[PDB]
Design a protein around this ligand. Sequence first.
Ligand SMILES: NC(=O)c1ccc[n+]([C@@H]2O[C@H](COP(=O)([O-])OP(=O)(O)OC[C@H]3O[C@@H](n4cnc5c(N)ncnc54)[C@H](OP(=O)(O)O)[C@@H]3O)[C@@H](O)[C@H]2O)c1
Ligand SMILES: NC(=O)c1ccc[n+]([C@@H]2O[C@H](COP(=O)([O-])OP(=O)(O)OC[C@H]3O[C@@H](n4cnc5c(N)ncnc54)[C@H](OP(=O)(O)O)[C@@H]3O)[C@@H](O)[C@H]2O)c1
Ligand SMILES: NC(=O)c1ccc[n+]([C@@H]2O[C@H](COP(=O)([O-])OP(=O)(O)OC[C@H]3O[C@@H](n4cnc5c(N)ncnc54)[C@H](OP(=O)(O)O)[C@@H]3O)[C@@H](O)[C@H]2O)c1
Lengths: 474, 474, 474, 474
Amino acid sequence: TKQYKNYVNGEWKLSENEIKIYEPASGAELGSVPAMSTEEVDYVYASAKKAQPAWRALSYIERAAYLHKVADILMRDKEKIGAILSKEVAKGYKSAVSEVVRTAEIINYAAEEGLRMEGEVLEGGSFEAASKKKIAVVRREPVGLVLAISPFNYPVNLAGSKIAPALIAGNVIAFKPPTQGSISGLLLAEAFAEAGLPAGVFNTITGRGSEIGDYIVEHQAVNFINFTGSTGIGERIGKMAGMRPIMLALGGKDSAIVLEDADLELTAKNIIAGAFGYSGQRCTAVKRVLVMESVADELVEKIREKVLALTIGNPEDDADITPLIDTKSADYVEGLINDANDKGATALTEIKREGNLICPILFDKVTTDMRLAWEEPFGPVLPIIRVTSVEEAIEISNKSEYGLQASIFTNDFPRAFGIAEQLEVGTVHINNKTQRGTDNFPFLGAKKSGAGIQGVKYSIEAMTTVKSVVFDIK
Amino acid sequence: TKQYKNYVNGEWKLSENEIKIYEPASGAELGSVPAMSTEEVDYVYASAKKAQPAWRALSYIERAAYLHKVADILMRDKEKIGAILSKEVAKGYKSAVSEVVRTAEIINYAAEEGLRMEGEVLEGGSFEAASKKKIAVVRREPVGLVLAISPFNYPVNLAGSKIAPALIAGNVIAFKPPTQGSISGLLLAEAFAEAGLPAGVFNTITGRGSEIGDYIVEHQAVNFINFTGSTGIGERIGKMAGMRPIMLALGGKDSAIVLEDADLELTAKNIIAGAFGYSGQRCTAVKRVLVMESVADELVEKIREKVLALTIGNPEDDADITPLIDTKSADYVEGLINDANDKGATALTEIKREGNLICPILFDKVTTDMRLAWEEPFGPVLPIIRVTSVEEAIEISNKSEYGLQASIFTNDFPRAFGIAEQLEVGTVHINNKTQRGTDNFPFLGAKKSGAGIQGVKYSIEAMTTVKSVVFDIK
Amino acid sequence: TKQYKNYVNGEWKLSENEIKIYEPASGAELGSVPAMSTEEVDYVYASAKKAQPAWRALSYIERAAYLHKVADILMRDKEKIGAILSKEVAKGYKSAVSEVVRTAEIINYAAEEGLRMEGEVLEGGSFEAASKKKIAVVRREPVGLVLAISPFNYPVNLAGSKIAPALIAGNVIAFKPPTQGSISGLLLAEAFAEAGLPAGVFNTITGRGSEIGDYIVEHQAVNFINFTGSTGIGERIGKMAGMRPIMLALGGKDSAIVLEDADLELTAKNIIAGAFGYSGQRCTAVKRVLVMESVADELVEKIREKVLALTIGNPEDDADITPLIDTKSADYVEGLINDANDKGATALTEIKREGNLICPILFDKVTTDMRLAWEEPFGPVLPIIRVTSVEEAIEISNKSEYGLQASIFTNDFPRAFGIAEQLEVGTVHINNKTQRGTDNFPFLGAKKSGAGIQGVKYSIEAMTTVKSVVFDIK
Amino acid sequence: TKQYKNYVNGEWKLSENEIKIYEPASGAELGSVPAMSTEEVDYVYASAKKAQPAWRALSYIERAAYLHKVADILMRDKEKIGAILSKEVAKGYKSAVSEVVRTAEIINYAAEEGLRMEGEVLEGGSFEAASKKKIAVVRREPVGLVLAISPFNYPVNLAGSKIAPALIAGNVIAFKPPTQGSISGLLLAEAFAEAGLPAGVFNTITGRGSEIGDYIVEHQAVNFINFTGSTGIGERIGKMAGMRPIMLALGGKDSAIVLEDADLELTAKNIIAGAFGYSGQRCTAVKRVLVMESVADELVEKIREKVLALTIGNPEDDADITPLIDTKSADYVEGLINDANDKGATALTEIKREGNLICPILFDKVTTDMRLAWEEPFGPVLPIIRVTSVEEAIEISNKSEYGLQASIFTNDFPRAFGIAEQLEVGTVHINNKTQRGTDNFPFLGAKKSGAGIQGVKYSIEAMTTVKSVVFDIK
Ligand SMILES: NC(=O)c1ccc[n+]([C@@H]2O[C@H](COP(=O)([O-])OP(=O)(O)OC[C@H]3O[C@@H](n4cnc5c(N)ncnc54)[C@H](OP(=O)(O)O)[C@@H]3O)[C@@H](O)[C@H]2O)c1
Ligand SMILES: NC(=O)c1ccc[n+]([C@@H]2O[C@H](COP(=O)([O-])OP(=O)(O)OC[C@H]3O[C@@H](n4cnc5c(N)ncnc54)[C@H](OP(=O)(O)O)[C@@H]3O)[C@@H](O)[C@H]2O)c1
Ligand SMILES: NC(=O)c1ccc[n+]([C@@H]2O[C@H](COP(=O)([O-])OP(=O)(O)OC[C@H]3O[C@@H](n4cnc5c(N)ncnc54)[C@H](OP(=O)(O)O)[C@@H]3O)[C@@H](O)[C@H]2O)c1
C-alpha cells in the first residue's frame, strides 16, 4: 500500500495504524494515511508549542517570504495535486486543479495582508482630562497554536484559508484534514515541508475524527480551533472549545429569492451553476428557490431545460455531476428525494441513482412539510418553493436554522438592499448565485451556519489578539 | 448705526473704519461691521498664535466640552440669530433658523468625532527583517492657526463646519465671514465668546475681501486656509497658499442625468427642489438637466408645472424664491437669461425681474453654444439639455470645468454605479437631488470645484498633520 | 422590607419569591429583590426579542439620544445611587458615587462611539481580475439579544460598560446584576426606565446565579453572553455558550515587575494604590510584586510604611480598607494568610480580622510554594516575591493561569517594551499600577483571565456582526 | 556618445537636442539624454491622458502584476543599473546597487499596499434620523496624470517611491529625473518598458529643469505634482500648482538633541552615520548637534575620532566620503566652512578640498551667528552647538525654517516623547539617526521641509481621490 506520512516537527512520520483511502467514483485504492494515537497528537502539539516563540520572533516579512514560497510550490504542482485530489474526492479534474490554484492565491494574499497588520495609539485624553498624557500603544499578537480542520469538499483550499492567515500572524499550526481528503491534505503539507518553514511551525494530524476528533480539540495546547464541516460536529466543537476562540463555517440552505421583475434567464443560469456545482456538495450552494408565483412557471422551465444540459459521470471527464462522496451521503440524498416525491412534489427530472452517482433532480411545488424544504442535502437535488410575496419569501428564508448566504434576483436594487437587511445570513448576493468568493470578502454564517468571520483579513484578525502597552508622556 | 465688533483675543474690538450692511430684500440698514486694518489683522494672528500651545495642551475632552457649550448657546439663540441671518442674506426665515440648527449639529458632531482621533503603530518588520524591533508611534497633531473664510449663502453654517473640526484638533481659528454676512458671522462669534474658550483660541476678522483678503491669506502666521466661495477667489487662494495646506469648496454646475427608465415624477420633484432652493444660490444646486430625448417632453412639463407652484417674495414670508444677494448678481443672471433667449432657448416660464428679485425660469432646448449651458448662475434659472445617449450625457457633464456633484435618475442601479464612476465629480446622488448633505459624508469637488475633502471627519483629518515617533524595542 | 422590582417589557414586576439583601459592613437589611422563576426569565427574553426589530429600525442618533438621557439621569442621581451602592457592597461612599459617574461617562462615550460605526467597501478586483466589477458593501448589524452579567465589585459600572455598547448597535438587553448588588443594579434600571427606551429594549433579571444562572445562559433566546465575574463561572459560561459569541472578564493575579533602575518611591506609591484599593477586591489590582533582590529591602520598607497610612473602617467613612463582601470571602483570605505564614513568609504588617474587616497585610519573602503566590485573594494582602533576573520575573509572571494585566517599573523604556511583549497579559502599564483605566483603551485578559476584548469600541465591535451585500457594477 | 532615449507612449524617442552627462568623480563622459521641446512634453502628456482610462479599467491585481514584474527586472539588473548610477552621481558602488534593491522593494510594497485599498460605507443615520435609510458608498479613484520629479541623490529610489504608489491606484505617470541622474532615470524606464505596461501609462521627460521645468509643471494636463528637491524649487512648484494637489519633500537641517543621560557611544555612532552618509547629501542627514554642555566635550571627542575612520575617495572604491555632485555645490559647502572658521568656530578636523572632494569636517562651538548653524549644506560638514537646557535645544531646533526630522538621544523615553511633541518636524527618532526608512512609515516635513505625507500608503492616499455614491435603501 502507498503509505502517506504526517509532517511533524520537520519530519515525515508513519503511525502504527493506518487508514486506507479509496476513490469514491471508482473504488480504486488511493493509498493510506496514518491513524495517529493520542500520544502522537501530544507530540505534534508539544512540537508546535516549542517552535512558536522563534516563529513569532521572526519579522512579518520573513513569515510572508515562507508563505509565498509555499504558494509557488503549489502553483508548480497544481496538476500533480489536482490529479490526486480529483480522485480522492470525486471532484472534476479541472475543478481540482482550480482548487489548488485558488489555494496558492489565498496563501499569497494572506501573506501580504498579514504583513501590513497595523496597531493603534489611543489617547487617555479622549476619555478623561486627567489622563491626557497617558496613551495606549496597541499591537496585534498571535493567539498561539491554531488547530485547523478542513472538510472533504475543499480539503486543500479550506485548509490554506485557515493555515496562511494563522501563520502570517505568528501562530503555529496543527492541520487535520478530513479522512476522505487526507491524502490531498498531506500533499499540501509537502509544499509547506519543501518551503522549509522551521520544524514545528506547521504540522499535520490524521486519524478518524470519530476517534481522535474530541481529543485533538479538547487538548489544552490548542489556543484556537478553526473548523469547516457539518453543523453537528461544529456544535460539539463549540462546547469543547469552552472559552477558547473558534472559527466555525458550517452548513447552509441558501435561498435564492426571485422577484417578479427578475431577469429570468440570468436567474436560471445562476441558479443552475450554484445549485449543481460539485453535485450540490457546497455549503454556499443555492439550496432552495423562493420564487414569486407569477414568474415560477417560466423560471422552472428554464431551470428544467438547463438541468438537462449538465454532464454526468466521472471526475476525469470533468462532468458537472460526479458521484457523491460516499454511500451514506448518496443514501441520505435519495431518502430526501423519495420523501419529496412521496409527499407529492412535482419532479421535473427523472429520479435516478447508479452506485453513488445521483442524477440531477429538480422538484417544483415543494411545501414546508417536505424534508427537502429544510434539510441540507449535499447532493444534486433542488427544491422550488412558490411564494406570493417578498414578505413570505423572507419568512420562509429566515425560518431555516441555517443563515450562510442568500441570493436575490430583481431589477430593484434599493429594495434588494432592504430585503438583504432583513435576511438572517452573512452575505446577500444581488443578481448572482451565492459563493464564498472573492476571498478578500467576508465569509460568515448566521444561526447554525457559523461562528466567527472569515475571508482573509477577518481570519487574520480572528486569530490574533491585542497587546496594549500604556504609559504616561512626560 | 448698530455697530458690531470683532472678537479678538477674548475682547470685543471696534475698528477705526466700518462697513454698513443693508438687507438685500428691503435695503434697510442692518448694522455696521469693522473694516480692519492690516495691523489689526496682525494682532488677531499674534493673539491666536500665542494661545495655540495652551489650547493644544488641553485634553480632547476639554476642547469638545467647550465646543458642545457653543452648540448649546446656538440652539438657545436660533431664532435670534436666524432672524438677523434671514435679513442679512435674504434667506427665508425658517431656512435661516434651520442653518443655525445645522451649525449646532455640525459643531457637536465634530467635537465628538475629533475626540476619538486615533493614531497608528507601524512595524519596521512589515518592510524589512533587520528592522523588526523598530516601530513608529504615529499621532495626529494640529497644523496650528487655521484661517476660516465662509461664503454669503451660508455665512454661519459654512463657518462652523470649518471652525469646529479645526478647534477639536487643537488648532486656533481666525474666522473671516463674508462682508454680506459679517453680522451673522459676528453673532456666531458671540456663541464662542459666551462659551468661554480661552482668549485668542477663536477670533474674527472683518473688512472687505477685495482689500484685506490677499493680506490675511498671504500672512505667514496662517498655517492652513479653509475657504468656501467663488472659483475665482479660490484660484487666487491656491496661488497665495504657496506650499501651505488648503481646503477649497468652490462653484458647481451639477448635472442631473435622466435616463429613459427614470421615475419622472420623483425626478421632477428633486430637480425642482435642488435647482430652486435659495433661488439657485447653492454650490450643490441642480444646475443643468441632461435628459434623454424620449422622456424630455414629459419631464419638462412636470417641472414647468411645479415651477409655477413656487412662492416668490420676501425672506420673512419664507418665499421659495427670494431676491438675489445683490444687484451685480442679478445683473449677471439676467445676462445669461438674455444670452440663452437670444440664442433660441425656449423659456417655459416668464422672464421677469423686479429689483433684484428674479422669477424662477425654466429654459428648454438649451444647447452647448449657450452660456447658460456652462456658467454657474447663482440665480433661479434652469437649463434643460436633451441628449440621445448616456454616453452623450457623460461627455457633456464632464466637459464642464466644474465637478462638485451629479444626480442620476434611473431604475437601473448597477448601471447608475457604472455611470457614477465615469462622472468627474466628488459625489453622485442616485435618484435624489445633489446636496452637501449628511454632514458626516464626504463633500468634495473635482476640477475647478475644489481642493481637499470636507464632511466632518475629513475636515478634521485635513486640518491635522502627523507626528511620528520611531524607536527600537529591546 | 423595601421590595425592589425588575424592569420587564416596560413594567416593574415583583416575583412570588424574593431575596433579602444586607449591608456587608453593618449587617443592616437593605431591602429585597425578586427571585425570578424560569417562566419569568422566559418572559423577559420573549419581550426583548419582540422589541428588537423596532429598536434596530431606529437610526443610530435616536438610540444615542436615549443613551445620553440615561447617563443624564445617572449624573443627576449620583448621590442617591452611590449611597445605596456603598452600603450594598461595602464600597467607600465617594468611591461609590465615583462608580456611578464613570458609568454615565461610559454610557455617553459608547453612544457617541457607536453612532459613528462605519462599514467598508471591498473590491473583487483586489483578489481576481475577472471580479473587477464585483464589490462587497459590508455594514455592521446587531447580534440580537445580549445577556449582560455584572460582578459585585462594580455592579453598576460593569453593567453600563456592557449595556450601552450593546444598545447603541441595535441589540436588546437582559441585565442580571450580582445578587449582592442587585438593588444597585435595579437602581441603574430606574434610569433606563425614566429615559423611556421602548418596552423590552432593556430588561433586568434577578435571582441567585446558583439557581437560574445556567438557565439564563443556556436559554436559546440569548445571542451573546457578556460576563464579568469569577473564572469558575466564566469557564461554565464558555461551555454553556456552545458556539454563541461571548465576552468574559475574569480573575487576575497582576504582577508588578520592579527592575533595579526603578523609581522606588513612585513604584511604592503605585503598588500601594493598586494593591489595596477597595481592599484588594479588583480584578486589576497589583497582586504580586516581582522585585529584583538588590532593591527589595528598600522597596519593601516604603510599601510597609505606606500601608500603615491606609485608613481602616466603614464605607460611610470612606476608609481605604473596608470590610470584605462576605464571610466566606474573608475566610478564604484568612486561609491564604495562614498558609503563607505557616510556610515561612514574613508578615511586615499585623495580621488582624474583626468581623469581615481584614487589616492590610504585607508579606515579604513569599515563595512559589505558597498559595498566596498564585491564588487571587480578593482581600488586602500583598505578597512580595524576590527575583534575581528579569527572565525569572517573566517566568514566574507567566507561570500563572491568569493574564489580565501587568506593571513594569523601570527607567529603561525600550527594555520595558521588550518585556511587555513577553508577558502573557492583555495590558502592560509602564511605571503605573494596573487598571482597566481609560475606558476607551482595550481591556482584556489572556489565558484564564478572559475571552474577548472590552473597552468601548471593542465591546461595540464584539456585540455586532456584519452583513455583506455583494453585486456587480455595470 | 552613448545616446539615451526617453520612453514615450511605448516608444524610445531621441530629441533634436541632447545633454551630455559626465561622471562627477572622474569627469568622464557617461552619455547623453534628450533635451525635450515643449511640444515633445505635450506629446508625453497627451499620450498618458489617452492611456489613462484603460489603465484605470484594469483590476488592481493586474496593475500590481505589472509593478511586481518591474521590481523583478530591477533585482535582475541591480549591478548593471547600480554601476551607472554610482558613476553618474558619485555614490559608492554598493550604495548604488543598494538604492536599486530598495527601489524594487518599494515598488513591490506599493503594488501590494495599493491592491488592498478599501472604501467606506457611511450612514446618514449617524448624523440625522430622517436620513437613516441613506448611505454613502465611498471608493478611491486616481487623480489622473501624475508628474513625478526625483532629485540627484536618489534619482531612482525617489522616482520609484512616487511612481509605483501613483500607478497601482490607476494614475498614469510622466517621470522627470534630475539631469545629473537622468541616465539612471532612463535605466529605470527600461524596466517599465520591459515589464510591458501599456503604451502611455508610464513615460519619461528629460531636459534642463531651468528650461522646461516651469513648462512641465504649469501644464494643465498634470493632475498632481510629486516632487523631491530643493526648497527653492519646491516653493515655485507650490505656486505653479495653483489649486492642484502636490507632494513636496524638500530640504532639512535635522537636529540631533543630546541629553545628559545619553549613551554617548551610541550617540556618536549614529551621529557619524547620519551626518556623513553620502557626504552629507541627504535631506534627512543629521545636520546639527544640540548637545547639553556637560556631555559635550566627551561626545565631541567620540565624533572627532569616528570621523577620522571614514574612508575618502572614489565611488568605485565604496568610499564613505565621495566627491560632491558638482563644483557649484562644493563651492557652496566651502563657503560655509570658511564662514564658520572665520567666525571662530573650532574645527576639529582639517579643512581640505581637492577637486569637488571635500574631506569630512566637524566644527564645535557653533554659534547662531554662523551660516553653518542654519543653512543646509549638502556637504560633509557638521556643526556642534552646545546648549544648557532642553528648552534651549527645542528653541534652537524650531527656530530653523526646516522641520523634516529630529533625533533625540537620552535614556528617558517618556521625556523624549514629551520633547518630540514640541519639535516642529515630521518624524522624531529616539536613540537613532534620522532616516526616511522604513518605507512603510510616514515621511513628511513641517515648515519649509515639505507638503504632504509620503511613505507608501500615504503616497497612495495622496495620489487618489474619493468618489461618493449616495442612495436610499427601500
Ligand atoms: N456663478 C456666479 O456668478 C456666482 C455669483 C455669486 C456667487 N457665486 C458662488 O458663491 C459661492 C460663494 O459666494 P461668494 O460671492 O461669497 O464668494 P467670494 O466673493 O469668492 O467670497 C467668499 C469669501 O471670500 C472672501 N474674499 C473675497 N476676496 C478675498 C480675497 N482676495 N482673499 C481672501 N478672501 C477673500 C469674501 O469676503 P467679502 O465678502 O468681504 O468679499 C467671502 O467671505 C460659490 O459657489 C460661488 O460659485 C457664483
Ligand atoms: N479570588 C476569589 O476567590 C474571588 C472571589 C470573589 C470574586 N472574585 C473576582 O471578582 C470577579 C467576580 O466577582 P463575583 O464574586 O461577583 O463572581 P461570580 O459569582 O462569578 O458572579 C459574577 C456574576 O455572575 C453571576 N452568576 C453566578 N453564578 C452563575 C451561573 N451559574 N450562571 C450565570 N451567572 C452566574 C452572579 O450572580 P449571583 O450574584 O446571583 O451569584 C454575578 O452576577 C472576578 O475577579 C473574580 O476573580 C474572586
Ligand atoms: N540650500 C541649497 O543651496 C541646496 C543645495 C543643494 C542641495 N540641496 C538639497 O538638495 C535636495 C534636492 O536635490 P537637487 O539639487 O536635485 O534639487 P533641485 O535642483 O530642486 O531638483 C530636484 C528636481 O527638480 C527638477 N527641477 C529643477 N528646476 C525645476 C523647475 N523650475 N520646475 C520643475 N522641476 C524642476 C530637477 O531637474 P534638473 O536637474 O534638470 O534641474 C530635479 O530633478 C534637497 O534636500 C535640498 O535641500 C540644497
